[PDB]
Design goal:
The chain is mostly helical. 75% of the residues lie in helices and 2% in strands. A two-stranded antiparallel sheet has the order 1-2. The chain is globular, with a radius of gyration of 19 Å. It binds (2S)-2,3-dihydroxypropyl (9Z)-octadec-9-enoate (2 copies), retinal, hexadecane, tetradecane (C14), dodecane (2 copies) and decane (2 copies). It is found in: Membrane.
């Protein structure tokens, strides 16, 4: 029970690796956008911001994680709480959604509640992360419902023509969004096993979310950027 409940040099090394990749992606996108026509540049800037924020967060986690503070719980159930990741997510997950929202004609009211659910989800996550005992699962479950809500909203332009910008390319939107949803559903599983249940150790949770973050940010960004380039080229 509660195995390996503090970050070690294993977790720290993993964070430095993810830091390096996020920083490199931000730099590469920042140089690339200089060569691209103006209508494409917003999408590059969104992804430059995502990767820059993530690099900053991983720098913070790698430099400070060895302090083995703060913690939640006492005695044998005490476990380190890494909370920088939530500060990352409250800014980057709306930007990740924005990547796809930019490919739609969703009205402002709809974008608003999708983004609102997203921010709520992260908020319930960090509150749950610091909550000792069974009430943590109320936060968890409501956060999971918020993921379902934001996903439902993002799904609607797929089959609602009035929400579509360029219908002939619904396929690219659909594919990117399914990729995003698959990855995002893994995050609460990791949280449930780690921050929530104390079933997996802190280094393991670090590595798992490191892998997810690489897939969900710079690899996802490359997919989005390729999509908007190809679509713009065909218009
Ligand atoms: C122009 C606005 C740009 C967006 C606003 C800033 C975005 C935030 C950037 C990075 C967020 C993650 C860094 C947040 C820093 C977390 C601090 C930490 O890791 O604590 C370690 C513990 O040992 C101490 O208790
Ligand atoms: C659309 C494609 C979706 C792909 C989803 C891939 C999700 C990957 C995330 C997590 C998978 C598990 C990887 C984590 C691998 C285990 C980490 C580990 O063993 O830590 C070392 C310890 O033994 C020492 O303490
Ligand atoms: C780049 C960072 C990403 C894509 C982070 C995504 C995070 C989530 C999808 C978080 C989901 C959560 C729940 C649905 C319930 C509460 C716990 C969270 C915050 C891990
Ligand atoms: C679209 C919402 C999907 C939410 C999926 C949540 C999966 C939760 C799995 C939790 C695994 C850890 C169980 C707790 C062990 C103590
Ligand atoms: C949209 C569907 C929401 C599903 C929420 C799933 C929550 C998983 C329950 C984990 C609780 C474990 C308590 C020990
Ligand atoms: C705390 C809320 C942070 C949100 C910052 C990201 C905003 C992304 C733009 C959403 C579309 C308007
Ligand atoms: C040490 C464990 C390595 C796990 C590698 C997972 C990589 C996921 C690739 C998914 C591609 C879509
Ligand atoms: C009408 C059905 C609404 C279901 C919301 C969940 C969206 C699918 C997430 C996989
Ligand atoms: C720049 C894109 C990096 C994607 C890395 C995906 C592999 C993660 C497991 C090693």
């Amino acid at each position: 029970s509660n195995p390996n409940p503090f970050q070690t040099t294993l977790g720290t090394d993993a964070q430095w690796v993810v830091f390096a990749v996020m920083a490199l992606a931000a730099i590469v996108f920042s140089i690339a956008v200089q060569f691209r026509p103006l209508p494409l540049r917003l999408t590059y800037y969104v992804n430059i911001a995502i990767c820059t924020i993530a690099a900053t967060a991983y720098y913070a986690m790698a430099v400070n994680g060895g302090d083995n503070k703060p913690t939640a719980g006492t005695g044998a159930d005490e476990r380190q709480v890494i909370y920088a990741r939530y500060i990352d997510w409250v800014f980057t997950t709306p930007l990740l959604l924005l990547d796809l929202v930019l490919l739609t004609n969703m009205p402002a009211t709809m974008i608003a509640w999708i983004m609102g659910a997203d921010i709520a989800m992260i908020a319930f996550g960090i509150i749950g992360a610091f909550t000792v005992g069974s009430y943590k699962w109320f936060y968890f479950v409501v956060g999971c419902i918020m993921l379902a809500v934001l996903a439902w909203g993002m799904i609607n332009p797929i089959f609602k023509e009035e929400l579509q910008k360029h219908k002939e390319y619904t396929g690219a939107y659909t594919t990117l969004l399914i990729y995003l949803i698959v990855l995002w559903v893994i995050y609460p599983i990791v949280w449930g096993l780690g921050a929530g249940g104390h079933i997996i150790g802190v280094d393991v949770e670090i590595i798992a979310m490191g892998i997810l973050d690489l897939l969900a940010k710079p690899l996802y960004a490359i997919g989005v950027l390729i999509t908007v380039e190809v679509v713009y080229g065909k218009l």
